[PDB]
From Swiss-Prot, chain A:
Phosphothreonine sites (modified residues): 2
Disulfide bridges in this chain: none
Family: Belongs to the DASH complex SPC34 family.
Entry's localization field: Nucleus; Cytoplasm, Cytoskeleton, Spindle; Chromosome, Centromere, Kinetochore; Chromosome
Function: Component of the DASH complex that connects microtubules with kinetochores and couples microtubule depolymerisation to chromosome movement; it is involved in retrieving kinetochores to the spindle poles before their re-orientation on the spindle in early mitosis and allows microtubule depolymerization to pull chromosomes apart and resist detachment during anaphase.
Highest taxon of the lineage: Eukaryota
UniProt name for this protein: DASH complex subunit SPC34
Range covered out of full length: 198 to 246 of 295
Taxonomic source organism: Saccharomyces cerevisiae (strain ATCC 204508 / S288c)
Curated annotation (Swiss-Prot), chain B:
Boundaries of the shown chain within the full protein: 302 to 351 of 451
Family affiliation: Belongs to the NUF2 family.
Subunit structure comment from the entry: Component of the NDC80 complex, which consists of TID3/NDC80, NUF2, SPC24 and SPC25. The NDC80 complex is formed by two subcomplexes, TID3/NDC80-NUF2 and SPC24-SPC25, which are joined end-to-end through their coiled-coil domains. It has a rod-like structure with a length of 570 Angstroms and globular domains at either end. The TID3/NDC80-NUF2 globular domains are probably directed to microtubules, the SPC24-SPC25 globular domains to the centromere.
Location(s), subcellular: Nucleus; Chromosome, Centromere, Kinetochore
Protein name per its UniProtKB record: Kinetochore protein NUF2
Miscellaneous comment text of the record: Present with 1550 molecules/cell in log phase SD medium.
Function (record text): Acts as a component of the essential kinetochore-associated NDC80 complex, which is involved in chromosome segregation and spindle checkpoint activity.
Length: 49, 50
């Protein structure tokens, strides 16, 4: 059976992209990860509480 | 000389062509495997989920 990416939990996708930014730490990618992780811990974490 | 350079060489070429035929048949069987039990099976499951 086929399962979409969104069916995987958001935390695992965030960890994958964090690893990607670890292996490609260039400033634009690092800033994009910082912004997206801040949006994570703000919006989705506020939604989590 | 006729047997070796012409008849047996023709036999060797014929055997190589038969081996290519068998390889093509195996590739065809694999492609029907990827199709029926695969790509059409994937089509069936995708249509089921859709």
């Amino acid at each position: 059976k086929t399962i979409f990416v969104e069916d995987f939990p958001t935390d695992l996708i965030l960890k994958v992209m964090a690893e990607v930014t670890d292996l490609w730490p260039l400033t634009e990618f690092k800033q994009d990860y910082d912004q997206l992780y801040h949006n994570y811990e703000q919006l989705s974490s506020k939604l989590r509480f | 000389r006729i047997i070796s350079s012409e008849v047996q060489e023709s036999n060797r070429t014929e055997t190589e062509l038969v081996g290519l035929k068998q390889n093509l048949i195996n590739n065809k069987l694999k492609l029907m495997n990827v199709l029926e039990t695969g790509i059409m099976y994937k089509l069936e499951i995708l249509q089921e989920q859709l």
